Amino acid sequence: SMQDPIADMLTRIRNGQAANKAAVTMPSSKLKVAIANVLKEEGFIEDFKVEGDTKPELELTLKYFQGKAVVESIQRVSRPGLRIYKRKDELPKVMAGLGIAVVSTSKGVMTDRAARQAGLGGEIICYVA
Amino acid sequence: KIRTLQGRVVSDKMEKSIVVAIERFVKHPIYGKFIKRTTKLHVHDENNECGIGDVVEIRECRPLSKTKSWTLVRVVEKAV
Amino acid sequence: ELQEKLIAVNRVSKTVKGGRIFSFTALTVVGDGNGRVGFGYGKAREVPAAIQKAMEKARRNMINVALNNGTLQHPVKGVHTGSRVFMQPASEGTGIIAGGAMRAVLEVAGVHNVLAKAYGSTNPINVVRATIDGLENMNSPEMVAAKRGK
Amino acid sequence: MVTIRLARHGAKKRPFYQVVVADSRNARNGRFIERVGFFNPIASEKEEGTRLDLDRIAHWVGQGATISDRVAALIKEVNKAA
Amino acid sequence: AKEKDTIRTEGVVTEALPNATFRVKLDSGPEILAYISGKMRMHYIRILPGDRVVVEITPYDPTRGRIVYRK
Amino acid sequence: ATVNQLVRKPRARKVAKSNVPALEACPQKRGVCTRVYTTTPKKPNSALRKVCRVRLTNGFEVTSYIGGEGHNLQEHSVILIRGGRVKDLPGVRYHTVRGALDCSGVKDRKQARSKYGVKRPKA
Amino acid sequence: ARYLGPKLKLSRREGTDLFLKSGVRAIDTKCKIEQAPGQHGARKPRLSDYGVQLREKQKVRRIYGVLERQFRNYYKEAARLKGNTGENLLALLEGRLDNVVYRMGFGATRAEARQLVSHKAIMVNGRVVNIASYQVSPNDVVSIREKAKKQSRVKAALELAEQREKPTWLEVDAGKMEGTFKRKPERSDLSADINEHLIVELYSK
RNA sequence: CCCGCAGAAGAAGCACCGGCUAACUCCGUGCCAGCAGCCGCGGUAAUACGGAGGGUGCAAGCGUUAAUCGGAAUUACUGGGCGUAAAGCGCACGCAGGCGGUUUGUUAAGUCAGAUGUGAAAUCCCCGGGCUCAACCUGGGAACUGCAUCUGAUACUGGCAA
RNA sequence: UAGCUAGUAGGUGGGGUAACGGCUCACCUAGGCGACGAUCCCUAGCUGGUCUGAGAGGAUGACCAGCCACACUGGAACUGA
């Protein structure tokens, strides 16, 4: 059995962008939507959508710059077997600010840029290149 | 206010004597894993009324005999 | 005109029925000091012929690389074969601190300060192209602005 | 017992004293409670060179500390005003 | 630079060991271990016991000869 | 390797043994010696090269190269013994210091007198 | 301390003049530039990438007349300071006392300038200063004292001093044997001979 | 510490120069003598040995040796591998241990925020000051990546309930 | 080096110490510690630090300063804050 659906969601993104597909599906949850909202805020994905009731199903519309994918890469930085926490001072920056991280703070799911402006830290999830 | 800890018995019982294993969480500094540390303490009690496997609040006191320098205060849901 | 130079020359034998016979393999890098980086790997029966044939091939195979002040836009990694090349921009002052083979390919692009180090294999032929792949993928604020947001 | 006294950390043939609160048993260079000033006898033409926080020294005198004869002289030198 | 204090004298080859090493009995001296010289190896020449060869000996170690001259 | 495994059993550095049993954080040692041979090298080279069996003062018997052109050394003689392998010979990891204790310097040597133990020519 | 050897050999080895002699005349005949010193210097060098770095270290060091250990101390100070290290290097070298005496033109040569500061002719802000390596400040007057005033040594120097192009960071004065150091050199003020990233690069490995 | 006197007078050596690695020819010896950190040189024209001339590096030091770290991502947390190169137990079930779908409530342990106490001084670091300058000495600040207690936040993980 | 512990583990009472205490005694109960490495062996004074390293780390604890231990070998007490 799979042990992280979040790294699964990131894997479905980089496989979809590489294969040049439009719609990518997975079973929905709150943090999956909240991460996809950060992706649409920064601009990487086109749109999120959810459809269902007994099993809600998140449908992520991917995005293409040209024939080239918008997302360069995406990696799971904190992982189930090894948890990484970043304090307010220690908040990292992805590729000299050109990328973003995803960070779960006390005040919710932010970027590293938004968490520096908010003035608090927490568990970093992934580096969006 | 006093400082205090919470642990669980998981131990045999003797005359006015109970041991309390206190589990805690520490980040392991070389590899960054969060690892469960076990702090076992001998404890003084109110006429050994506690069970086994339940969760007990605990606090420091004078030595009452070898290593028995803690005393219990309150118990959540005694025995099972 | 553009800046041209050579990295190294290496002798190679075919080895045939009548005995050994020795070719010469050169490796060359060119650049305009404003990106426009290009390289050429050539070979010949004698040495002064080999570097000319390499520099001829160096004119085409020419790639455009982002540059600001005297350095790279952001930290970049690149790999080719066994050779792993890391680098960071290290803005203002500083000078160039960089590996063998790497230093020639790095300089002709037009950086004047930069940090770089070769992991893995340091064989010149695979240290080259690992570099060009790292320089080619490199982004800019303009490039990200084109595909998303501000 | 506590004593206010001059300890020498400066270079050879150029003493730079550190006036300091310490117990009497401990060696001159040794263990101490707190620093309170400095005294440069070699000095230079600059204004700074004798310094002592009087709120600290009057506190330690209030706790009963006694004063070494040089520090006693330097206190009655600097006073409120010299 | 080299000094000419090494001594050359004859002997009969008693027995061939491994490694192109030979047990040579001198005329005056004892039986000494002698290795073949470079020149014989260079011109692909091999030798055999019972034959009488010139054998260079050093004063430093008198147990090690050197087979200088041909069969 | 897996991170739980590295918590369980950590990484372990190599022992990093020295080339010289003379050791003891010492650059120089002393010995009384016995025998001076002139042994052949390995077959890619040829020569007869001057080698000595040094009994060290710490009780170790070792073998040692004699550099320079000839020497006075024989029998019971006290020499100084520094490190350094000679790979062309078998197992020699040491060198005798010329111009020290009982050892002669190299007479009529003119260059590189830091080695070979030779005070400067004056005329 | 000091090089002490033949001056022209260093200029001939480096292949560009280092101004070490150069009093009465900038003579071509003596120098024999780009022919190299010694027997086999006639041949083309075909120099290495390590060697062009090592040559440039010697080229800069031989101008100011420094030794490697003292020169290393300037590199360590120039490195810890904010901004470009090569520029902060050349600033500390130009900030030497024996160098300012050459710039003001009180001495004919850098060796004669070091001789005059060693021989206690030179005073800075009314202190006498023995040490050649001494670091001059902004706002520093400098002057010759009475014993060394109006000798054949200074008098011949002040004549040949007029030929020079004249520094931009100091006031020359010198109508009464003094000078004033106004402000720091910067990269534009100082010469274009030095390759500044290159000399710094060699210490990196 | 300062002044005076005399006169270039009293004061430069050491390693290295085949490639790596900055810096070359001749003579002697002839796989001998010997050099060699590594790959290697020398068997009659040795840029590698010995000597001389020339050259290069560094300086009252220079070189060798021993000792430690670096280069070494060559024990790889950051930062490595395991088809054929060293490397997946012969295979399976399983306790201790690691990790865990999805929804809500709650707790605030982990975690994150703030404050206080403490983190000796010397050191290290920065800005200044004083010894002819520097080394050295020294003023103040920052640093001391830490830990404990208290007050907050509740996204995430853990505890607890459905 | 995988089992090790009888004052060993706990209680009551007596004695003892400046004072808590199996500290030391009598009696009673049968526990204690143990793979988050007990016990045993080898080796080692520890730390603020030094040295190296881009950092993480590694090696190391001379000098300076804090603390402990030892004073020919082995054992004990007196005097005294």
UniProtKB/Swiss-Prot annotation, chain D:
Cellular compartments per GO CC: cytoplasm; small ribosomal subunit
PROSITE patterns the record matches: RIBOSOMAL_S16 (PS00732)
Keyword Ribonucleoprotein appears in the UniProt entry: yes
InterPro entries with a match to the protein in the record: Ribosomal_bS16, Ribosomal_bS16_CS, Ribosomal_bS16_dom_sf
Any GO BP: translation
Family matches, as SUPFAM superfamilies: Ribosomal protein S16
GO MF annotations, alphabetized: structural constituent of ribosome
A Pfam family: Ribosomal_S16
Key word Protein biosynthesis present: no
Keywords: Ribonucleoprotein, Ribosomal protein
UniProt-listed PANTHER family: 30S RIBOSOMAL PROTEIN S16, SMALL RIBOSOMAL SUBUNIT PROTEIN BS16M
Family per record: Belongs to the bacterial ribosomal protein bS16 family.
The protein, known as: Small ribosomal subunit protein bS16
UniProt organism field: Escherichia coli O45:K1 (strain S88 / ExPEC)
